[PDB]
Design a protein around this ligand. Structure first.
Ligand code: SF4
Ligand code: SF4
Ligand code: SF4
Ligand code: FES
Ligand SMILES: [Zn+2]
Lengths: 125, 117, 242, 693
């Protein structure tokens, strides 16, 4: 199922496959934009490490880091491919299943439906 | 003048070099570190160093605050901060400022203040 | 429904449909009100068979064009929303929907406006553009942002402060609005300008020569050599429609 | 039923009556737009979405053109492209040249679609220049630069329809049409922060976040909000060591695409008043100290105090995660104590609704269940404050179908019409035996909403008894296809606490503790702590709880650790750490594990996977994430917990009061935020900026 340690032929540090957890997901539809072009690929990136994520240099005020994977992120065409890759490397992962908008029928004419009782609210346009 | 350090010892700094700028005493942004704090945190690298040689440029906030308000007839003031003497485009992108509200309204790029009269 | 189409209905029902069809040509049948205004000798309001000729309608009801048929520049058949007609083609044109649609106009509300040779056509069309700018409800972006562009261009054409390619630019600006608005106010805004360009571009060219020789050389959008921005305003250039 | 049509040659099948743009979206065809949005009414004023359909002579608005059988749609005709260019040309004519200074820049739809569909250059160089627009003050949360408004009316549509705040609207006509209030009035609603996301251009912008970063330099992390108990899904944008902003991400079964203003703007409380080093009280002052020194001081206080059994009390606050609660409870048990209390009033005693079955303290109808409601009775609860997004959900349900809402409890300002049946338990008896009880009996999908504030009353037994009797009687309220009994928690941690049995024993409530351990626990008073008690505080912000302590330990905040939170639905959700804890702060369950080792009761797990294993041992539904499964014990639970043991309780004559006095400041984070402080004083009821008349 999962490649153990020390028969990975990549040469990466053992710590990568021992005490690091990656996460696989699809990017969420950004709330700020209506475009959806970034949401189809399956990203893979590493969960952060507490001590080594980022600190502030005491000279010019920069963001120092000891985590060599903080900037790395792979793109895959499909969830199964990402799973296969992570398994072949021996990475512990978690899958975050995507959420989608539930379909509902929208009619422009619905803005002008006659109301037989009291108006619940004044639509304004 | 006298800033106490984390050690509990005293650091002496001339008054002129505690001012944030030559023309302004205090910070002009919440995140901006004051000179007092700068020395308190970097005093090791400031030893045997001559403060009068350090850059100390003028604080532009007051310089723009000294510029008089331009009065305009209509509802919209147009500003582009161009240099009428040299060639090319040397200003900032041309924007239009609404002046119907009471008071002066500042150009978003250059800070020049306009008012409807 | 319009008021007069409802108004004619009881008389139509009483007198019968065939009698009403007898007046006016096929598909253009009945008698409409014809408000007549502008540079005619006696402005009037009358009712008349549909498909009457212009010349006859004018000379019989409104004492003719002020100065005679020679002194006619053009006529706007229907209200301001309809492209203006030229002198040569309006002699033989018929007052049904069909003929006016054939000469690329429409009956609209049959509100004929006549303009004599003394009057300036560009001033009239600019005023129509100002009317549409004032009248847009501002809901849909094409109309909302296009009527103001058309006004800004028409002022400069009224003074001549433009280059001659900006005429074709303006035509395309009209086409930006025509088919894309929520309601037909945008169509109405686009049309008078297109009629003006189609029929009186030489007049615009003469007035642009008047601006160039008379005042100065103009770049696109009305800028000139020493037109600059100073202390909040534009100085160095007329700026039409301040 | 589902009808068929072709879009750009493809074959797409869609429900009849849907808009053409829904069909295009389903068929994988991209259509530009501005004014259209999935959660808002259809407007059709931007004219960006035009397409050609063979029947129509002129291009048609895709967001508002209903689909019909056999329709043929082309989104790629030369006429369509020319149309998009024309529309964009007109859109940008009066748009200000503000991109270097606009906060939207880099994530602006006007930019992206101008670049994708507009022309490379512009034709508008008018010496008269562009139009300009006054700026409008609508409160301390949403900064306005109205020159950039493109008049999409998303803000108006949302403020009117979704949040029920009608002060926003459009004044004037034509070119001078301005979005605003026509006079100085705040956009006063707890959902106001969402017009920031809805406004496609930079006209409406986050004010506390203004000018602090650009979208391309932000690290985006998907995590879980903990301000309320709804469990909204959020995206945390951070650069380096500090968190910049919080924006919603879609989860159609929890918050839809919205979050309330507290969840959005209390992020600024995470970079001030923080706890960074252990503190030890010496005299009347705290002194900084090392982790070893702190923990050894705790051990020495434990050996000196010598607590027996329930003399070691543990209190859990509104914000803590499940793993930390589990650690704390296990350690306290291994000390021989059962005094694992919650922080709420009367939290020294066990809750009146019981703990045995989950459906006794959860939103048994899912949050999505509100969509089906035909009648709702609110008992001692104000959802507008306790769960804002759920209030919006109830509002949407009420707008689009007929629905009867009545409430018992304080007179509440609601976004929907409610019937007030009284402020008292007697009024509840009258109602449940009266006309609204009949309405519930007849209803097809009824649901009874009980606030968590009632559980905190001494007479909670009487309310739970009355409600349980009514439920056990009426089959519509509780059958095998629909559970209408619902408890609405307000704190993100109450559901998880009850799930693991973080409940005091009967004999524990009698004892007077000699040592108190506050985990969060910032609702504590002077009274609940004995003077002689040795108090340990563990948290992330400095608040009253840390003021009460003898030793303070810094713990990570919800943005700095990957924890489990259980919302009102009983849904278990996992968060992700955006940044690392500041200073010398630590992960909470690690803190508990280490202190337990110093106490000689060393916990059996020292690794996150072992923590998840212990969680699976406590309950199997903590490890199943994003899953809701109904209870098979619906009928048993009501009888065994609500009507059974609550017979003896005597109802008081005290009227029901509001659970939370101030919506904006309810937590340590929220009380540490300058923005919430400013918002609270800006959005006060007695301020004319928030009145209307
Ligand atoms: S085209 Fe019609 S709806 Fe659109 S802005 Fe003009 S008048 Fe208003
Ligand atoms: S709203 Fe968009 S297009 Fe307008 S200035 Fe800001 S970033 Fe640029
Ligand atoms: S402020 Fe934003 S959302 Fe409101 S009308 Fe203007 S562009 Fe649309
Ligand atoms: S998105 Fe369809 S017209 Fe605006
Ligand atoms: Zn400027």
């Amino acid at each position: 199922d999962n490649v153990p340690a020390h028969e990975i032929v990549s040469g990466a540090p053992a710590e990568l496959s021992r005490n690091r957890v990656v996460r696989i997901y699809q990017q969420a539809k950004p709330a700020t934009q209506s475009g959806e072009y970034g949401t189809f690929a399956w990203r893979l990136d590493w969960d952060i490490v507490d001590v080594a994520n980022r600190w502030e240099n005491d000279l010019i005020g920069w963001q120092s880091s000891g985590d060599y994977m903080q900037a790395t992120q792979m793109k895959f065409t499909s969830k199964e491919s990402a799973i296969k890759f992570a398994n072949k490397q021996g990475w512990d992962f978690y899958i975050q299943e995507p959420h989608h908008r539930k379909f509902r029928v929208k009619q422009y004419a619905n803005n002008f439906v006659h109301s037989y009782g009291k108006l619940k609210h004044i639509r304004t346009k | 003048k006298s800033i106490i350090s984390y050690n509990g010892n005293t650091i002496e700094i001339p008054e002129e070099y505690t001012k944030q700028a030559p023309n302004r005493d205090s910070t002009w942004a919440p995140a901006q570190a004051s000179k007092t704090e700068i020395y308190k945190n970097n005093m090791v690298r400031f030893e045997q160093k001559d403060l009068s040689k350090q850059p100390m440029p003028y604080a532009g906030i007051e310089l723009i605050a000294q510029q008089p308000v331009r009065f305009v007839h209509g509802n919209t003031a147009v500003c582009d901060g161009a240099n009428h003497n040299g060639p090319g485009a040397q200003g900032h992108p041309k924007i239009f400022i609404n002046v119907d509200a009471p008071g002066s309204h500042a150009c978003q790029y250059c800070g020049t203040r306009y008012e409807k009269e | 429904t319009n008021v007069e189409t409802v108004a004619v209905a009881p008389t139509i029902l009483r007198r019968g449909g065939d009698w009403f069809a007898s007046f006016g040509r096929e598909r253009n049948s009945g008698t409409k009100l014809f408000c007549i205004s502008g540079n005619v000798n006696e402005p009037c309001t009358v009712e008349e068979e549909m498909s009457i000729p212009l010349r006859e309608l004018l000379e019989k009801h409104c004492g003719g064009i002020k100065g005679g048929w020679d002194n006619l520049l053009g006529v706007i058949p229907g209200g301001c929303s309809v492209p203006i007609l030229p002198k040569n083609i309006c002699e033989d044109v018929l007052m049904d929907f069909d003929a006016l649609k054939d000469v690329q106009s429409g009956l609209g509300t049959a509100a004929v406006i006549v303009i004599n040779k003394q009057q300036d056509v560009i001033r009239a069309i600019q005023r129509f553009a100002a009317f549409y700018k004032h009248e847009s409800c501002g809901q849909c972006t094409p109309c909302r942002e296009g009527t103001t562009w058309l006004l800004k261009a028409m002022d400069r054409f009224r003074t001549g402060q433009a280059k001659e390619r900006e005429i074709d630019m303006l035509y395309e600006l009209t086409k930006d609005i025509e088919g894309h608005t929520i309601c037909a106010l945008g169509d109405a805004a686009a049309w008078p300008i297109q009629g003006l360009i189609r029929n009186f571009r030489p007049e615009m060219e003469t007035r642009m020569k008047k601006f160039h020789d008379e005042v100065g050389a103009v770049s696109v959008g009305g800028w000139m050599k020493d037109a600059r921005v100073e202390k909040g305003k534009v100085v160095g250039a007329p700026l039409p429609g301040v | 039923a589902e009808i068929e049509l072709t879009i750009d040659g493809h074959k797409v099948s869609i429900e009849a009556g849907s808009a053409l743009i829904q069909a295009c979206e389903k068929a994988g065809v991209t259509v530009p737009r501005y004014c259209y949005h999935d959660k808002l009414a259809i407007a059709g004023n931007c004219r960006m979405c035009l397409v050609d359909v063979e029947r129509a002579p002129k291009p048609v608005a895709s967001c508002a053109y209903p689909v019909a059988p056999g329709m043929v749609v082309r989104t790629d005709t030369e006429r369509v492209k020319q149309a998009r260019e024309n529309v964009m040309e007109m859109m940008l004519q009066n748009h200000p040249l503000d991109c270097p200074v606009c906060d939207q820049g880099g994530e602006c739809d006007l930019q992206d679609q101008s670049m994708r569909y507009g022309r490379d250059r512009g034709r508008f160089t008018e010496i008269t220049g562009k139009r300009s627009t006054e700026d409008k003050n609508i409160g301390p949360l949403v900064k306005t630069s109205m020159n950039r408004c493109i008049h999409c009316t998303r803000c108006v549509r949302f403020a009117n329809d979704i949040a029920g705040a009608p002060e926003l609207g459009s004044s004037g006509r034509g070119n001078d049409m301005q979005i605003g209030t026509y006079l100085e009035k705040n956009l006063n609603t707890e959902l106001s922060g969402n017009v920031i996301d809805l406004c496609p251009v930079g006209a409406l912008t986050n004010k506390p976040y203004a000018f602090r970063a650009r979208p391309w330099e932000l690290k985006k992390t998907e995590s879980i909000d903990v301000m309320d108990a709804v469990g909204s899904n959020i995206r945390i944008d951070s650069k380096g060591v500090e968190v910049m902003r919080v924006i919603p991400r879609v989860h159609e079964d929890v918050n839809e695409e919205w979050i309330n203003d507290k969840s959005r703007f209390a992020c600024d409380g995470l970079k001030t008043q923080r706890l960074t080093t252990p503190l030890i009280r010496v005299g009347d002052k705290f002194v900084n100290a090392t982790w070893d020194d702190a923990l050894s001081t705790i051990a020495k206080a434990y050996q000196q105090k010598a607590p027996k059994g329930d003399e070691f009390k543990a209190v859990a606050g509104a914000l803590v995660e499940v793993e930390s609660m589990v650690a704390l409870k296990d350690m306290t048990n291994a000390l021989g104590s059962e005094n694992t209390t919650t922080d709420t009033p009367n939290g020294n005693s066990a809750p009146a609704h019981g703990i045995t079955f989950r459906s006794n303290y959860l939103f048994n109808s899912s949050i999505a269940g509100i969509e089906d409601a035909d009648a709702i009775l609110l008992v001692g609860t104000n959802p507008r404050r306790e769960a804002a997004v759920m209030n919006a959900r109830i509002r949407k349900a009420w707008l689009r179908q007929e629905l009867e809402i009545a409430s018992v409890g304080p007179t509440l300002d609601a976004t929907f019409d409610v019937a007030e049946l009284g402020n008292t338990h007697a009024d509840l008896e009258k109602a449940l035996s009266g006309e609204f009880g009949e309405v519930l009996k007849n209803a097809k999908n009824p649901l009874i909403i009980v606030g968590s504030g009632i559980t905190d009353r001494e007479d909670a037994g009487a309310f739970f008894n009355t409600i349980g009797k009514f439920v056990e009687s009426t089959p519509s309220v509780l059958n095998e296809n629909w559970n209408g009994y619902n408890v609405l928690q307000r704190s993100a941690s109450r559901a998880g606490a009850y799930d693991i049995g973080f409940t005091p024993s009967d004999e524990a409530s009698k004892t007077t503790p000699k040592m108190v351990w506050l985990l969060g626990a910032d609702e504590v008073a002077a009274s609940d702590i004995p003077a002689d008690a040795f108090v340990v505080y563990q948290g992330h912000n400095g608040d009253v709880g840390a003021q009460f302590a003898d030793v303070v330990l810094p713990g990570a905040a919800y943005t700095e650790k990957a924890g489990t939170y259980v919302n009102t639905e009983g849904r278990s959700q996992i968060s992700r750490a955006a940044t690392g804890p500041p200073g010398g702060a630590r992960e909470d369950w690690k803190i508990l594990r280490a202190v337990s080792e110093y106490l000689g009761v060393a916990l059996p797990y020292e690794d996150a996977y072992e923590v998840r294993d212990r969680l699976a041992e406590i309950s199997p539904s903590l490890v199943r994430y994003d899953l809701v499964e109904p209870t098979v014990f619906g009928d048993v639970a009501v009888q065994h917990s609500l009507v059974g043991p609550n017979g003896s309780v005597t109802p008081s004559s005290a009227p029901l009061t509001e659970t939370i006095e101030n919506f904006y400041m309810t937590d340590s984070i929220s009380r540490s935020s300058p923005t919430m402080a400013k918002s609270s004083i800006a959005f006060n009821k007695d301020n004319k900026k928030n009145q209307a008349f």
